[PDB]
Amino acid sequence: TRGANNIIAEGIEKMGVRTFSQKEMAFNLLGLLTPEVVELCQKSPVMADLNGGLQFVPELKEFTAKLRKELVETSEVRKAVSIETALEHKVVNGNSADAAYAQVEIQPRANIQLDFPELKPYKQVKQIAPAELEGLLDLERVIVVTGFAEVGPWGSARTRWEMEAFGEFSLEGCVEMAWIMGFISYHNGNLKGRPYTGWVDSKTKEPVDDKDVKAKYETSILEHSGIRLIEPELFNGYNPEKKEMIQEVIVEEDLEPFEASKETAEQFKHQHGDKVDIFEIPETGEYSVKLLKGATLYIPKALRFDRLVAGQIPTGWNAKTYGISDDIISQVDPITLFVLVSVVEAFIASGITDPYEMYKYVHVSEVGNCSGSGMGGVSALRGMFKDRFKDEPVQNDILQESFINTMSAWVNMLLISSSGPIKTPVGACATSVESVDIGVETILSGKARICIVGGYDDFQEEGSFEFGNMKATSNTLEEFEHGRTPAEMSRPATTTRNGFMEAQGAGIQIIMQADLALKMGVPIYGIVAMAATATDKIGRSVPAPGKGILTTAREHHSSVKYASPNLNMKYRKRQL
Amino acid sequence: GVATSFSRKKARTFDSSWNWAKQSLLSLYFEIIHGVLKNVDREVVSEAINIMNRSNDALIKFMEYHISNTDETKGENYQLVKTLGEQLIENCKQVLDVDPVYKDVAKPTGPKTAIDKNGNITYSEEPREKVRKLSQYVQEMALGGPITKESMDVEDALDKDSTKEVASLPNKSTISKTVSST
Amino acid sequence: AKGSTLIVVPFNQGSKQDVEALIEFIYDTEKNGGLGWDLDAIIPFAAIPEQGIELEHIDSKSEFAHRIMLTNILRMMGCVKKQKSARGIETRPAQVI
Amino acid sequence: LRAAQQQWGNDFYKRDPRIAPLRGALATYGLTIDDLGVASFHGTSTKANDKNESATINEMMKHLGRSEGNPVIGVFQKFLTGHPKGAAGAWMMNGALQILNSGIIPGNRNADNVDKILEQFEYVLYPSKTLKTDGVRAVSITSFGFGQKGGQAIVVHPDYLYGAITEDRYNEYVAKVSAREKSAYKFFHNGMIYNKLFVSKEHAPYTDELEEDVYLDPLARVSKDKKSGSLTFNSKNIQSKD
Amino acid sequence: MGEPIHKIATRGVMLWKEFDETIFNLPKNKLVPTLEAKRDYIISRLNADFQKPWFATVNGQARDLATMTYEEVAKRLVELMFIRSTNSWFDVTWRTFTGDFLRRVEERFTKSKTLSLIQSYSLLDKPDEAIEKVFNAYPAAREQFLNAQDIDHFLSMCQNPMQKPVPFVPVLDRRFEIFFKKDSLWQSEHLEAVVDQDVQRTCILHGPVAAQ
């Protein structure tokens, strides 16, 4: 059965003996599960010979070892004779006789495109719509998406799409991921004396060719992208195996006095009252703080948490790589960096390199932002609830960075500088669709002409743990018991689905009136035909999803005997 | 070597053939419209067998819609998919309430080894000359060879017109004289 | 095809505990986390390659390969016999290929 | 004129209780309920959500008399990305636009075995592998939040827009986009290699002396400054009779 | 080389003089802002008056390297460096420059490893046909500005010391004085290789008194 022995199979077949493909031999074996051979097996054991006459070849091993020998002899000879006749020819006629014959190989470099929509000739695009549609629509009340972007576990929208659709990066997607993850930096000038222009390894500064990027980095890219084990370095050393908590213990015997400042001692006195004794040391001026029997301490302990896996932005992703200054990175919550990168990368996808160009066309009061979040600056909330408790050093303005509307404020204060509407929705898992519902109405109401819509959320210890306690997220210890790897734990509409996989990042779209979009000559990725929200009904389970959005299909059917002339575009055109 | 590997909790069940039938049809439909599968390719007959083995009323309605709403005028590849589609529907209606069948229609290959000038060993699986179905493979097996000795012609449309070979799939060929007589 | 089901399981035919457990899992009821099945065929094709192992080289690998390719095929047939005997199944034999 | 176009082009179905908001939205561009060919499901990989969503879409299609045999193709982007809460729909939307412009419908590569309970929903198909279609006319995006936040959005293929304008307007549009696209590609590559895609504005487009003059004038627009080359408000173009 | 030199007051040398008094006398902190400020004026005079024009000039309209297609770059290279009168490249190093550029076009726009269409730079000795051959295989390159990486590569190639200095200014930057002044004397012997064959673009050395 073929599929090392294959090379001589044809040799054997010359003896009048049949070798089989896997398919042929499978067919033969399924011949033994036919009802008449099953009946036959139940009477007495059945010996099937599926050998193909190979028994009748005498001394098969010496016949087989011969056929190898002739094939390897003939190969190996012809190879040596061809290398010696090459070497003769080349010594007689010199190396200059094989120089005009020799040829040059062009190696591909990554030429990353922006994938603007392909615009068909006006003949072809006129055919798809009805003839009546021309001048029927008010283009001021048609909302189009002109740009979009995202920062997510697969990097940009470009790279996410390559992995969603084809499950493997192209050279262009592989270079973009290497650039995003900081494996490759660009270099233009002197590098080991010689002048070099192109990609270099970010660590070793060694030149890297675009062809080599995939062999050199793809394994590391796929390992540190997408849904994977939580990486403590990305989440402020958080480690779900060792989740730090504190247990209130009552002291049973007086502690060894420790040295603290005068303000720290009087703070210890004020808390513990008579259960502590603070005394000045005359020499140093520092105080001695002695906790007495009955005083309250907090001893750290480490709980082991069962949610080990998340959809994390690729390891090495840095807002510096996109040009955000350290003054902004140190100031804002991590989530705001996702939003700033999404918004510029959305404006670039709409061909708007300078947001102020929008103010050639619309008033500063006509560029809205309607993006929002479920939880907002959760790293700032940790700072102001947990890190401030533990008297860790936290910026004075941490509260401002916590607020869900703040990300949109930074987008205005750093990029857009508009006086347009600002209507930040909070929709939990449906925030982005509520954001579009709002953005559209903001435009149709005249209150804006361009709007930024989208959502963003970060992933952090506290939220991870609360989605755990609520049993919303997949228990990663159960998923391991079932042999699921991280890459197969988010399995929608599957029999064995057992909770969602948490992730982080942002997604932004630019929407505007079609009339304006055509006038600015921005790309138009699609039309937002409808956008609605809906609550469900009386209940007691806040997480429980319901059938409210069914309301978008509401239509009366008590009188449907004759077609309503209002649906017929030719009738509407005639009235216009 | 003797480390336990088995656990009940790692068992993966696959039974959603109702859903895969529709994906299998749709993927064939678009592969034919994009000219990835032609009216000669055997993979068109193989996929039409695997669709009929999953025939139910839901799938028939899926075919009826997607084929009836194919515009013939858009190209040769749309007229092809519409003709094949109409056949595949007739077939799927006939073999509704019929047990599904293991029916291999792949091209039976033989071994071929070749040594070029430079002594490179090339192994290819080349289509056999006398044998181009399984029916012919069974006849070839039944005759044996010269070394084994001690002391029919059925018209098929494989590799020419896949649509005509599909039209024949539900038709249970009656064997007048068995290959065991040859 | 329709009516078809495929159940992929991790398995080491080397292990007798896996062989017992596999057949126990197939024959157990759905209530106790089994399949509630009754085998009509067994195709024990599992095998590991042994290349360039002449008589004097027969060691651990060969003795293990032998356990997979003989001993535990007998154990696996024995298991299915004991499961069918347990449930008085005398008229539904399993075809061992 | 715009009011008439609004009354008969865009808002013809608002007063009418025989046309669903979902039907009218498509019907605007000449599409039917059959032309909504892809649904980008929330698809969180939770028992309750993935059943409810299927049931919801199934019951929308059934009521609006979607053709039997014509299921929407489900997309479950969250198999790859995970659920990022707020951002969930923003990603689903980005992918919907990518689907419209490609005619590629990605497969749920983690759809090992579709849940048997979902077979009752004839108007939904759950592919496990990417399908290159001849085209997608429209995509639904459903999101379900905590606290009863249900959402839907329909996104129509942009080629349905250009049917509503003249040849001269489309050709002018196409010319401006091709120019903008080139300048975008230039900006993008420069920004990528020199780590300056993001450029924080240091100043508003108006000086603090003109801030209240700009705000109060609805026709104030930026012009290219000759000195700096940057787009700014100029006192000449504020309350200008021109 | 920084020393006084007696040249016929042609339009080229009168520009040279103006730039000595207004641009090249400035300190190194005020050079780049002054070049950026005067960009449009400098470019207009280079193209009208000097033996080294602004390279990024597509059909008489001033541009930049970043706003030129690859086809526009390859065509302008042939326009400035290949002599139609003699039907030959003015310098083999210029033919190499143009050939190195066309290989970079194939590298940038090919999806897989392929054979170069320019196998030897001998094929450029008919350069119109070589350009057509390379921009028919890669017709995306006709409709796309230079990748930022290919701008840096082109400007790096212009600095190459082992070639005849390029007969054009390809960027206003700190090195503008070199691009303007380098290799300024051959043009009077070979007007066939100057833009309009215009003597008035060139530097001709001559004494004021001997000129009588």
PDB file of C-alpha atoms in Angstrom, chain D residues 178-179 181-183 185-186 189-191 193-194 227, chain E residues 66-67 69-70 108 143-149 152:
ATOM      1  CA  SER D 178      -8.018  58.257  -6.337  1.00  0.00           C
ATOM      2  CA  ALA D 179      -6.026  61.434  -5.446  1.00  0.00           C
ATOM      3  CA  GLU D 181      -6.053  57.413  -1.715  1.00  0.00           C
ATOM      4  CA  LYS D 182      -2.527  58.108  -3.125  1.00  0.00           C
ATOM      5  CA  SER D 183      -1.879  60.890  -0.541  1.00  0.00           C
ATOM      6  CA  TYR D 185      -0.748  55.748   1.085  1.00  0.00           C
ATOM      7  CA  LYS D 186       2.118  58.302   1.136  1.00  0.00           C
ATOM      8  CA  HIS D 189       4.112  54.477   4.881  1.00  0.00           C
ATOM      9  CA  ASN D 190       6.008  57.607   5.973  1.00  0.00           C
ATOM     10  CA  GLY D 191       4.186  57.458   9.362  1.00  0.00           C
ATOM     11  CA  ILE D 193       8.603  53.653   9.199  1.00  0.00           C
ATOM     12  CA  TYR D 194       9.161  56.972  11.115  1.00  0.00           C
ATOM     13  CA  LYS D 227       3.625  80.844   5.870  1.00  0.00           C
TER      14      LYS D 227
ATOM     15  CA  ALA E  66       6.868  61.397  -2.182  1.00  0.00           C
ATOM     16  CA  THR E  67       4.174  62.637  -4.716  1.00  0.00           C
ATOM     17  CA  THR E  69       4.571  57.498  -9.198  1.00  0.00           C
ATOM     18  CA  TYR E  70       7.326  54.928  -9.878  1.00  0.00           C
ATOM     19  CA  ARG E 108       8.207  46.348  -4.440  1.00  0.00           C
ATOM     20  CA  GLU E 143      -0.730  54.523 -10.286  1.00  0.00           C
ATOM     21  CA  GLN E 144       1.102  54.651  -6.934  1.00  0.00           C
ATOM     22  CA  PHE E 145       3.400  57.262  -5.337  1.00  0.00           C
ATOM     23  CA  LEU E 146       6.781  56.054  -4.083  1.00  0.00           C
ATOM     24  CA  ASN E 147       6.678  53.949  -0.894  1.00  0.00           C
ATOM     25  CA  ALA E 148       8.468  55.997   1.850  1.00  0.00           C
ATOM     26  CA  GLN E 149      11.158  53.245   1.969  1.00  0.00           C
ATOM     27  CA  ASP E 152      14.940  56.815   1.298  1.00  0.00           C
TER      28      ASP E 152
END
